[PDB]
Structure 1
Amino acid sequence: QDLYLRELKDTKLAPSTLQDAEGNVKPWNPPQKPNLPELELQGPEALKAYTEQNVETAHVAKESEEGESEPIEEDWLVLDDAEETKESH
């Protein structure tokens, strides 16, 4: 149909100008290529953790806590304390 074919033409070659050709758009002043492709590509990381989300900051798992291998001082006091607690058993 002419109304279909003409619509397809005006909506395809112009769609070519918008997307399929890097001619941006004459009717609209700011091209989306200088707006979306790189800066708004940081919009994904603007919503994400910037230079940190894609990066995934290095955080190595640490060691758990222990008694510093100290039986010279902790063992005797622990024994006395446990025996004192045993006085009401």
Structure 2
Amino acid sequence: NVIQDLYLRELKDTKLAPSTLQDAEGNVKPWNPPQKPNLPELELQGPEALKAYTEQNVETAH
């Protein structure tokens, strides 16, 4: 009765629809896709080090 009237009038006559994405963007974390951080490189290329290590390292006792 009064319930119905209140229900009918309020519900019918008051309609909402969700807010714009732009406003939403403000309230959320936006995200710009992560890049590739690093491209690895050759592992100590050149026998300069290698020759040094082969000759230098021995450390054997008598």
TM-score, scaled to structure 2: 0.18
> Which 4+ residue blocks in structure 1 deviate beyond 6 angstroms?
13-59
Identity %: 100
RMSD: 19.1
- Larger displacement relative to structure 2 (7-16 or 45-54): 45-54
Aligned residue-pair number: 59
2:19 alignment partner in structure 1: 16
1:58 alignment partner in structure 2: 61
Deviations 1:58-89 (A, max 9, x none): 99xxxxxxxxxxxxxxxxxxxxxxxxxxxxxx
Quote the Cα distance in structure 2 between the aligned partners of 1:13 and 1:52: 82
Report the CA distance between 1:51 and its aligned residue. 52
Quote the Cα distance in structure 1 between the aligned partners of 2:27 and 2:60: 37
Which has the higher relative contact order, 1 or 2, with Cα contacts under 8 A spaced 6 or more apart?
A: 1
- Give the unaligned 5+ runs of structure 1: 60-89
- Larger displacement relative to structure 2 (25-34 or 37-46): 37-46
Deviations 1:39-71 (A, max 9, x none): 999999999999999999999xxxxxxxxxxxx
- Give the unaligned 5+ runs of structure 2: none
Report the CA distance between 1:8 and its aligned residue. 0.4
Report the CA distance between 1:20 and its aligned residue. 17
When residues 57 and 22 of structure 1 are mapped into structure 2, their CA distance, relative to the original with a 3 A threshold, is farther
- Larger displacement relative to structure 2 (49-58 or 15-24): 49-58
TM-score, scaled to structure 1: 0.14
Report the CA distance between 1:19 and its aligned residue. 14
Report the CA distance between 1:5 and its aligned residue. 0.8
